[PDB]
Design a protein around this ligand. Sequence first.
Ligand SMILES: *[C@@H]1O[C@H](CO)[C@@H](O[C@@H]2O[C@H](CO)[C@@H](O[C@@H]3O[C@H](CO)[C@@H](O)[C@H](O)[C@@H]3O)[C@H](O)[C@H]2NC(C)=O)[C@H](O)[C@H]1NC(C)=O
Ligand SMILES: *[C@@H]1O[C@H](CO)[C@@H](O[C@@H]2O[C@H](CO)[C@@H](O[C@@H]3O[C@H](CO)[C@@H](O)[C@H](O)[C@@H]3O)[C@H](O)[C@H]2NC(C)=O)[C@H](O)[C@H]1NC(C)=O
Ligand SMILES: *[C@@H]1O[C@H](CO)[C@@H](O[C@@H]2O[C@H](CO)[C@@H](O[C@@H]3O[C@H](CO)[C@@H](O)[C@H](O)[C@@H]3O)[C@H](O)[C@H]2NC(C)=O)[C@H](O)[C@H]1NC(C)=O
Ligand SMILES: *[C@@H]1O[C@H](CO)[C@@H](O[C@@H]2O[C@H](CO)[C@@H](O)[C@H](O)[C@H]2NC(C)=O)[C@H](O)[C@H]1NC(C)=O
Ligand SMILES: *[C@@H]1O[C@H](CO)[C@@H](O[C@@H]2O[C@H](CO)[C@@H](O)[C@H](O)[C@H]2NC(C)=O)[C@H](O)[C@H]1NC(C)=O
Ligand SMILES: *[C@@H]1O[C@H](CO)[C@@H](O[C@@H]2O[C@H](CO)[C@@H](O)[C@H](O)[C@H]2NC(C)=O)[C@H](O)[C@H]1NC(C)=O
Ligand SMILES: *[C@@H]1O[C@H](CO)[C@@H](O)[C@H](O)[C@H]1NC(C)=O
Lengths: 50, 423, 100, 50, 44, 89
Amino acid sequence: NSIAIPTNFTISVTTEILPVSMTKTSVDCTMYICGDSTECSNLLLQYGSF
Amino acid sequence: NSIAIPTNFTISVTTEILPVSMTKTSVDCTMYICGDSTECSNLLLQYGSFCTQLKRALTGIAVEQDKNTQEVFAQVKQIYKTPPIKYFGGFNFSQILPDPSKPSKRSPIEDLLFNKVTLICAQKFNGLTVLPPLLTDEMIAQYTSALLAGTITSGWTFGAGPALQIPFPMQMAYRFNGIGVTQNVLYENQKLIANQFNSAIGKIQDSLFSTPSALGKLQDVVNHNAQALNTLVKQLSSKFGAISSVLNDILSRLDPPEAEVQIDRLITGRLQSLQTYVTQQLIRAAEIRASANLAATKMSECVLGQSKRVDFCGKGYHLMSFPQSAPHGVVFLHVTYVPAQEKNFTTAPAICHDGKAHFPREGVFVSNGTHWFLTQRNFYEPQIITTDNTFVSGNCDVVIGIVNNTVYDPLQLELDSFKEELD
Amino acid sequence: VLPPLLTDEMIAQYTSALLAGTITSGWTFGAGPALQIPFPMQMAYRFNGIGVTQNVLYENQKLIANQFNSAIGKIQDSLFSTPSALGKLQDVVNHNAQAL
Amino acid sequence: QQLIRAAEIRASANLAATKMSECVLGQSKRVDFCGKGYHLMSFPQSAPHG
Amino acid sequence: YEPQIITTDNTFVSGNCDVVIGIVNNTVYDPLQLELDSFKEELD
Amino acid sequence: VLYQGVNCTEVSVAIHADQLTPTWRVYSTGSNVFQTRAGCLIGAEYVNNSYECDIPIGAGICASYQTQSQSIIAYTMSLGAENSVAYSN
Ligand SMILES: *[C@@H]1O[C@H](CO)[C@@H](O[C@@H]2O[C@H](CO)[C@@H](O[C@@H]3O[C@H](CO)[C@@H](O)[C@H](O)[C@@H]3O)[C@H](O)[C@H]2NC(C)=O)[C@H](O)[C@H]1NC(C)=O
Ligand SMILES: *[C@@H]1O[C@H](CO)[C@@H](O[C@@H]2O[C@H](CO)[C@@H](O[C@@H]3O[C@H](CO)[C@@H](O)[C@H](O)[C@@H]3O)[C@H](O)[C@H]2NC(C)=O)[C@H](O)[C@H]1NC(C)=O
Ligand SMILES: *[C@@H]1O[C@H](CO)[C@@H](O[C@@H]2O[C@H](CO)[C@@H](O[C@@H]3O[C@H](CO)[C@@H](O)[C@H](O)[C@@H]3O)[C@H](O)[C@H]2NC(C)=O)[C@H](O)[C@H]1NC(C)=O
Ligand SMILES: *[C@@H]1O[C@H](CO)[C@@H](O[C@@H]2O[C@H](CO)[C@@H](O)[C@H](O)[C@H]2NC(C)=O)[C@H](O)[C@H]1NC(C)=O
Ligand SMILES: *[C@@H]1O[C@H](CO)[C@@H](O[C@@H]2O[C@H](CO)[C@@H](O)[C@H](O)[C@H]2NC(C)=O)[C@H](O)[C@H]1NC(C)=O
Ligand SMILES: *[C@@H]1O[C@H](CO)[C@@H](O[C@@H]2O[C@H](CO)[C@@H](O)[C@H](O)[C@H]2NC(C)=O)[C@H](O)[C@H]1NC(C)=O
Ligand SMILES: *[C@@H]1O[C@H](CO)[C@@H](O)[C@H](O)[C@H]1NC(C)=O
């Protein structure tokens, strides 16, 4: 037969931090691998559409 | 002291489209890489159990896709049927209920959804095959039909246990109480509400018919899997440094010692291509699973009940939802109550009468400039402020912005109309 | 690196719109047209929402406003003084920078 | 790795959007969804990438 | 299931018996009018 | 045994010609060859009675081991019991 009941209250503010987006990157595949070399580019073409 | 209160409302139906499943694929690793060559197969064996891992990853995906479909649609213990006479208070559900005259027994909207999104496929059949779904389109339509019959004939009691029949207008009245609008609003305007509902459904059918991008999410899932397979097949024509992309030509032209080198180059490239394909499929499978889990959550909370989560079941206050089947996914029609035609009234936090502060029990005090009334918050309906509609706590001093107005007490007024003069 | 489609100013404008809507029209904003309501009455409704009667707010309105203002000041001080308060976002930035 | 991180960020963004709708555009009754205690209201603030 | 007598305390009143579709005729009991009778209807 | 993506005619012809790569053969006697959308299922007797799904086959077809002695049977799965709700005004 025992119940506890609040007689006062506190207004509390808390902070929740959530990621929404990433840095958007773009990669030039051919320059990264072959860096402006024609011979490399011609060899790179043999690996298909990677 | 200014509050705006709706004086009218709109019944709105919105469409939410979610992917549930992917095309289920299966890859014969050895044929893809070696294509029936014994020499290649014997070289492939030296790379260990990569084909085994690839097979389990694709099998796991296929199983998950069937799990996703069952989790989204097979949420009902029994298949419910509608009554022979489809009269529900004036609410016309023919657009979302099975059409008995057409094969597959799909509703007009489901048939539209199936026609807009587009079992042996000769293209790509180079060891890459497609497995059928475990549940057929007819079985999914049957689950959708059961869910609709349950919702329409028994409301919210269906999801929690046995289906308990309730007249449809009373189901709506309950739902109106659910959004903080009294039952009499529905009953006084029942014809208006049914007409707005029917109009909104007709608008859904026209919107889906006329908008080429309405179902883009499902077409995108189909396009991504088709593109993934076209890329995987296309990679077979690459040489990867080999003298030729055709394994039979390598074996036809060279002796084993040289063929093994050219073959190993082709094996490395083709095996890497399969691992890339499988990894991308695992990532897509995870994204589809998350979508399917959202669709199942929405099915349980929007269709098998009434949700109070804002924007979870469409924009506006949620009243009810109806599922529809779609290729590789589910489309939900969310029926909501949208406030309309608001008017700006003067308000006060409390009314002061005999020195006591009176607060609304369920509502807000408003004034038209000459008289104070108590109204429900979501629908203007002025009532006389009385001791039955308000509660009393404290003196007319602490509350900021209290205004002076009469609060009527029926019993003291009644005592006067019974024996004030005694004789 | 490609820029975001929405600039920081545009995001701030969306946040500002969301705050103005919540502060001046409460919960009616999300469901449809924004209906103005006095802020203390919005809070009274919200108090009913948590099972506390309206008179609790109206009798203690000054106390509640003071506690709110104190809590917000505490948020500003907490974020200013704690180097790790925003670690989740710094971690996202650090992981992408490290990957590159 | 970027695809995996993108999936994790998408899940976070979906949570943030859900919280925006249920905590800012309404009053939530989900325990600990909108902070500790009984939820009264929430206010969004912008942050870099979140 | 827990049947109660339909009274003016359990229900609320809005409008006339015309607009609502499917309204049925039944007595709604008012305790105070009944009480007023069991106190001084005859005066003496 | 389920032969995936093939017609039962093609499989039966390949069996008679000794063209199949696996060299084991399922008895493949009468009533044990059933065409499904998934493929040709050999070694299970299809019945009209629906049952809850046990071992999935595909495209609505499941198989189970049931007493009818016992054998493996194939069937279209049941989705649930029918319940007609007594809706009324
Ligand atoms: C519930 O709504 C449906 C429609 O959503 C009503 O059924 C029939 O619907 C068609 C439109 O789909 C109505 O127009 C017809 O259009 C065709 C178009 O080719 C035309 O050839 C017909 O002459 C006609 O104009 C059709 O009038 C309507 N049927 C009736 C009897 O009005 C359905 O009747 C509605 N149910 C209830 C109980 O009100
Ligand atoms: C609350 O809003 C609804 C609409 O959202 C109002 O109902 C609409 O009322 C107008 C009249 O003001 C109706 O237009 C009339 O329709 C008849 C149809 O035969 C036409 O002949 C007339 O020339 C006129 O266009 C409209 O149909 C009706 N809409 C619906 C769906 O029933 C309602 O009156 C508003 N109530 C309040 C209290 O303001
Ligand atoms: C319920 O709790 C609140 C606080 O959470 C109590 O309010 C606080 O009451 C104390 C007095 O007991 C105030 O302290 C005094 O402040 C004045 C400011 O000038 C100072 O001069 C005094 O020496 C003393 O420190 C405190 O400021 C006040 N806090 C707030 C935020 O208003 C409230 O009294 C409690 N109520 C009950 C019914 O117990
Ligand atoms: C505010 O509302 C009251 C109640 O409807 C209006 O007063 C009534 O007006 C009607 C005519 O529309 C009269 O027949 C009633 O006798 C009036 N009642 C009372 C108690 O005076 C009042 O005019 C409205 N005022 C404004 C400014 O809109
Ligand atoms: C509501 O009515 C009360 C009286 O019943 C007003 O209280 C009086 O206010 C004047 C000043 O306006 C004081 O001089 C009197 O002493 C007060 N009398 C009492 C009995 O308290 C009260 O101001 C009125 N409030 C409004 C908002 O008009
Ligand atoms: C409920 O009772 C009222 C009378 O108190 C009925 O109203 C009468 O209905 C008849 C036709 O049934 C009419 O000819 C009378 O003119 C009506 N009288 C009044 C005063 O309205 C009403 O029909 C009854 N309703 C039901 C459902 O039995
Ligand atoms: C199998 O082949 C027969 C040849 O007559 C054809 O009628 C039948 O439709 C085919 N079945 C499938 C599933 O392709």
